[PDB]
Amino acid sequence: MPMTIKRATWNNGPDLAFDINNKANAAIEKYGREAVINAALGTLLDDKGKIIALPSVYDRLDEMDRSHIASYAPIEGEKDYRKIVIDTLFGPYKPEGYISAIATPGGTGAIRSAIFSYLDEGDPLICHDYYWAPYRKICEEFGRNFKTFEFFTDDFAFNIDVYKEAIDEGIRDSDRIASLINSPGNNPTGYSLSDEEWDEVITFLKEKAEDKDKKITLIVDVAYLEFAGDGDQQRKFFEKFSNLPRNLFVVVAFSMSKSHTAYGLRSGAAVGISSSKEIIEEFEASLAHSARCNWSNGTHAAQNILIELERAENKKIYEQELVDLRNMLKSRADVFVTAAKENKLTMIPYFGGFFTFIPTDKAFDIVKDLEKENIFTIPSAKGIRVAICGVGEEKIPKLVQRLAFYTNK
Amino acid sequence: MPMTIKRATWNNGPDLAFDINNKANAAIEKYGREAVINAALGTLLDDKGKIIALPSVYDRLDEMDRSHIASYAPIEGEKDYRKIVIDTLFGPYKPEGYISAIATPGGTGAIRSAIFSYLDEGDPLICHDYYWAPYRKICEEFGRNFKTFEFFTDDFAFNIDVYKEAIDEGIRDSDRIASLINSPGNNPTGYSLSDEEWDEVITFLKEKAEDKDKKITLIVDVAYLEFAGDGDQQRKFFEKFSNLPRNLFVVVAFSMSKSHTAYGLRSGAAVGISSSKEIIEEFEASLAHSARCNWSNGTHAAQNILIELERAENKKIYEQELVDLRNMLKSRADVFVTAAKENKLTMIPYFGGFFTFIPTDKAFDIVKDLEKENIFTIPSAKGIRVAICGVGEEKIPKLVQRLAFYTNK
Ligand SMILES: Cc1ncc(COP(=O)(O)O)c(C=O)c1O
Numbered sequence A, B: 001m002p003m004t005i006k007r008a009t010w011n012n013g014p015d016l017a018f019d020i021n022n023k024a025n026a027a028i029e030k031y032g033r034e035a036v037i038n039a040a041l042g043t044l045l046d047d048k049g050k051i052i053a054l055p056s057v058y059d060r061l062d063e064m065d066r067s068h069i070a071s072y073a074p075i076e077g078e079k080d081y082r083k084i085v086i087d088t089l090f091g092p093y094k095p096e097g098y099i100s101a102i103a104t105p106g107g108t109g110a111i112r113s114a115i116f117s118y119l120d121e122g123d124p125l126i127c128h129d130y131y132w133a134p135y136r137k138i139c140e141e142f143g144r145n146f147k148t149f150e151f152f153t154d155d156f157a158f159n160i161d162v163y164k165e166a167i168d169e170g171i172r173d174s175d176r177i178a179s180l181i182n183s184p185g186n187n188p189t190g191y192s193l194s195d196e197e198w199d200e201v202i203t204f205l206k207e208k209a210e211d212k213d214k215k216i217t218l219i220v221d222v223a224y225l226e227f228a229g230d231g232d233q234q235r236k237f238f239e240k241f242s243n244l245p246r247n248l249f250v251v252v253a254f255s256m257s258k259s260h261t262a263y264g265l266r267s268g269a270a271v272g273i274s275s276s277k278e279i280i281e282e283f284e285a286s287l288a289h290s291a292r293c294n295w296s297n298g299t300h301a302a303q304n305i306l307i308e309l310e311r312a313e314n315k316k317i318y319e320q321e322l323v324d325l326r327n328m329l330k331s332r333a334d335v336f337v338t339a340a341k342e343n344k345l346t347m348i349p350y351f352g353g354f355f356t357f358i359p360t361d362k363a364f365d366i367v368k369d370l371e372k373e374n375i376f377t378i379p380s381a382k383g384i385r386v387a388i389c390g391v392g393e394e395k396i397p398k399l400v401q402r403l404a405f406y407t408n409k
C-alpha cells in the first residue's frame, strides 16, 4: 500500500548510465587512465580526463562580491541576466516579435516548464525517435502524453514526412499539442536540422495553425548550441521564428551547463517568442508562478557570471576560450568521423554536440564486449552513444577500430 | 483564448513584498540609510543594512577546487551531503526508523516535492492560519487543496482544539491528507510549538493513523531551525517522530538558506522518516524522479560546502560564527519584546525566526501611515510582519514606538 500517489510511484529500474560511469571509474582505478576509454557521460574533459572549467567563467566567481552569491536572485532572474540571455542566445539572428526570458535551473527547468504550462493532461508532446530520456520522464511526471516519431530517413536526414504524419495525428487528437526538437547538436545522435529542414518544419506548423482552434507549442532545446559550428551558422535558423501565428508559440530552452562549463551551477532560461504582447506577458506570469513553486529562484552567482561576462574586457577573453574549447571538441569529432570512414563504421552524420552515435541492433551485446576491453559507452534499442566529449584525440582511433570490429561481425 | 492551460494561467496582480521593498530602497536613495527603517524581507542584514555572508561558509567556496563547483551533482545529492544533512539537522535527537535525505533547490524544493508526492488532486494540505504564501501557491499549481485552521488560541498558544477539528475534517472527506507545520521559528509569527504541543499533535495523528484506510503526511518546515534556540533545545522535538505507524509519514524540509547564509546558492533537502524500509525507498525513488524532471540536480558547490564544513577544524569556526549570528538575532528580538511591553504593544510571543508579528485588523491602513515615516513592513489580513532580521538593534525602539502609536490610536 504505497504512501506516494500513483503519479509519483516509480518502480525503479537501475540507472544504467550511472552504472556504466561507475564501472569506467573503477577501471581507471584498476588499470590506469590510458588503458581505459571512458566515453559514457556528457561532460567536456581535457585529454588528461580532468573536467574543463573555463577560467574566464570561474575567474568571475572568484572576483565576485560575496553578496552577489549570498543574496536571493529575483523570481524571474536578474533584469540584466534576462536581457543578456536573449542577446547571447540569438546573436545576430533575433526573431521579430515579443520575446521574454525567465530564469530556470539549467535547461531542464526550462523544458519542464514548457511541458507543464503549454500542455494539459491528455495532450501530446511529439518528440524524435532518439532523445534525451528526461523528456519522457517529465511527461510521465505530469501525466502529459509522450509520443515519438522516426527521426531519420534511410539517408539520415530529417524524416520530415514522418514528422508531418505525427503532427497530423496530434492535431487530429487534441486541440493543443507540442513539438520538441533538440537541435543543433542532438543528444544522443549529434545530428542538426539544416536551415532548410527548419524551413520545412516551421512552414508546416504555420499550415496547421490555420485552424485557429488549434494551439501549438514548439520547444527547441539548444543546450549544445555553442558546439554546433562557429557560433554564427548554427544560430541562423532562429530568424525563422519571426512573425509566426499567435497560436504558434516557440519556447527555446537555454542552458549555461554546456556553453559555460557550469553544469553544477544549474543556470538556464526558458525563452518565449510570440507575435502577440499579451501571450508573452502570460508566458511571464505563468513561469514566474512555477519558478516560485518549484525552485523559488535561480542560482544567483551564475546569473551574475553571465552579466559580468557581457562586459567588453571579459567578453573578449571568454570568446577565445570558447573558440578553443569549441575547436578541441570538433577535431576530436573529425578524428572520429575520419576513422569511421576508414574502418567502414556507419554513424549518424555528426553536426555538433557532445556525442557521436553508432546505430546498431546488438547495442547491449557490443558494450558488453567492449567493457571487457575497458571501453565504456551507452547502449539503447537504437544503438551506441559515444561521449566524444570525454575522450582525447589519441584514444579515438582505437575506439573506432574496436567499435567497428564488434559492430560489423 | 490563452496559450497557457487553465492551471498555468495566472490573472494574478502585484507582488506586494517586492513593491514594499522597492519603496524602501527608493527611500534610502532619497533620505539615506539612517532615516529609513527597512523591516520588509527575510534576509539577515548587519547593522549597516548590508547582507551577512558568513566567512566560514564562503571561504570554503573560495578554496574549493573548480571541479567540485563545475561538475554535476548526483540526482539525490552527494552521498556525504545526504548523510551530513541528517546528522546536522537532528543533532543528538535523531528519530528511530529509516531515514533518507534528497537534495532540493532550497527548502522550497523539499516542500513542493512533499506536496506533489503525498497529496493527489482532491487531497487537502492542512496548514496554519498564518503561513508563508508559497504553501498555498504550490497547492494551486498542482491542484492540491489548500486548507487553513486557526493557528493560535486567545492566549497565543497552539490551537490544538481547532487543529484537531481541521484534521478530523480532512480525514472525513479524503483517504489521503497532509499536515504542514512551519516550526520552530514560524514565518510570519515567530512562534514555536512547544515540546508538549508537538506531543499533542503526534499523539493525535497516531489516533487517525489507526484507520489503515487513511494515509497521513506530516510536513515540517524547519528553515529557521538554527534561529529558534541555543541549537540543542529546539531539536529535542524530533524524537517524537520515532516509531510512527506505517501510514504516518514525515517529511522534514531542510534548508541551508538561513543557517548558512546561502539563499542564492539554492540548497536544501527533503528528509523522510518511516518505520518501513520500503516506504523510504519508495520516497527515495519518487523524489529522485521528481528531481530529474524538475531541476535535474542540486547546486554542487553548496553540497560540497556542507561536506567541507563537517571537518572538525572547519566545523569549530562555523559554530562559533553561527552562535554570534544567532545571538545577534536574539538580542534584537529582546530589544523588540522589551520595547513592545513598555509601549503596550500586543505581539505574538516570539520563540525564534526572522520576524516578529503584530496582530491587527487595520494592517493595510497602518502601513500606509508607517511608509510616510520611512517605515516599511509587510501587511496581511492578520497583521504586520516586522523583519527583525533586517533592522539593527538601536533602531528597534523607534520602530516599536511608532508601530505602537498607529496600532493603538
Ligand atoms: C538535450 C539536453 N538538454 C538539456 C540537458 C541538461 O541541461 P541542464 O544541465 O542545464 O539542466 C542535457 C543533458 O546534458 C541535454 O543533453
Ligand SMILES: Cc1ncc(COP(=O)(O)O)c(C=O)c1O
Pocket: A295, A296, B042, B105, B106, B107, B108, B109, B132, B182, B187, B221, B223, B255, B256, B257, B263, B266, B267, B268
Ligand atoms: C517558512 C519558510 N520556508 C522556506 C523558505 C525559503 O527556503 P529556501 O530559500 O531555501 O527555498 C522561507 C522563505 O524565506 C520560509 O520563510
